[PDB]
Ligand binder design. Structure first.
Ligand SMILES: *[C@@H]1O[C@H](CO)[C@@H](O[C@@H]2O[C@H](CO)[C@@H](O)[C@H](O)[C@H]2NC(C)=O)[C@H](O)[C@H]1NC(C)=O
Ligand SMILES: *[C@@H]1O[C@H](CO)[C@@H](O[C@@H]2O[C@H](CO)[C@@H](O)[C@H](O)[C@H]2NC(C)=O)[C@H](O)[C@H]1NC(C)=O
Ligand SMILES: *[C@@H]1O[C@H](CO)[C@@H](O[C@@H]2O[C@H](CO)[C@@H](O)[C@H](O)[C@H]2NC(C)=O)[C@H](O)[C@H]1NC(C)=O
Ligand SMILES: [Ca+2]
Ligand SMILES: [Ca+2]
Lengths: 158, 53
């Protein structure tokens, strides 16, 4: 439930600011020039360099936990929760007896968008690229994720 | 103010260039590890469940 592909119709509509789809993904302003992008903060991706990737159509940076081709959904928008519930109902009504949710700890992130604490305090800020070089307090296990899981359980209880 | 972080890590200064030993005002630090931690709402709900008897 955490993310979709960049070829999904939701992302294609979101990147052009088309209706309620405009806010299914975490967008933010960023500075891109001469083939270089300045991210809003120093958050790092699990598999690589940065969690913020620039886009051309929207002229903004979107947020991805894992890869640049995996935009992360916005669970602070109730419409996304409604869509997830609809998908769950669609799969439940076909006879599936259970679900195994993957990567539930990555659902919510902090809204203040503050830098995370480095493990090596004296390391130069622009030479940090490994996911293991930062303490992840603002990107994993935020307040309200367990409520989302309980909402999923309540939906399945029907 | 019920729960606090267990890792006991320093909090982010509002003025990043301020000398670390000259910070004494409660308004000079962002309080992310000392207020509204994970599980406080569960404690409040436990209190409500206790009162429900
Ligand atoms: C993104 O991450 C890579 C790998 O973590 C970093 O280094 C690049 O590694 C690839 C693999 O050999 C090289 O082809 C690139 O030339 C490296 N980039 C350099 C040296 O700047 C790097 O942090 C990032 N690389 C890119 C291309 O975005
Ligand atoms: C990473 O932490 C280690 C200690 O935990 C330190 O590494 C030393 O940093 C000095 C500072 O210039 C550099 O000479 C070397 O990187 C390390 N020492 C020596 C003499 O090799 C430091 O806190 C961090 N490392 C870096 C890259 O500075
Ligand atoms: C608090 O923030 C302010 C800006 O937001 C800065 O204050 C300047 O810091 C310089 C650094 O030496 C000092 O000269 C003065 O304290 C301030 N400027 C001057 C010359 O008046 C700085 O980031 C923080 N202030 C302190 C105490 O350094
Ligand atoms: Ca997420
Ligand atoms: Ca307390």
């Amino acid at each position: 439930p955490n993310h979709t592909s960049d070829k999904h119709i939701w992302f294609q509509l979101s990147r052009t600011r088309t209706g309620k789809y405009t806010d299914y993904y975490i967008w933010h302003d960023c500075t891109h020039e001469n083939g270089k992008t300045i991210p809003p903060n120093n958050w790092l991706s699990v598999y690589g360099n940065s969690s913020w990737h620039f886009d051309e159509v929207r002229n903004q940076c979107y947020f991805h936990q894992f890869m640049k081709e995996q935009p992360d959904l916005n669970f602070r928008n109730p419409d996304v929760q409604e869509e997830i519930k609809e998908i769950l109902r669609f799969w439940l009504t076909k006879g599936v007896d259970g679900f195994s949710l993957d990567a539930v700890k990555f659902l919510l992130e902090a809204k203040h968008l503050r830098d995370e604490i480095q493990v090596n305090k004296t390391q130069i800020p622009d030479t940090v690229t490994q996911y293991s070089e930062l303490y992840h307090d603002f990107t994993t296990t935020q307040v309200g994720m367990h409520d989302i899981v309980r909402s999923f359980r309540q939906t399945m209880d029907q």
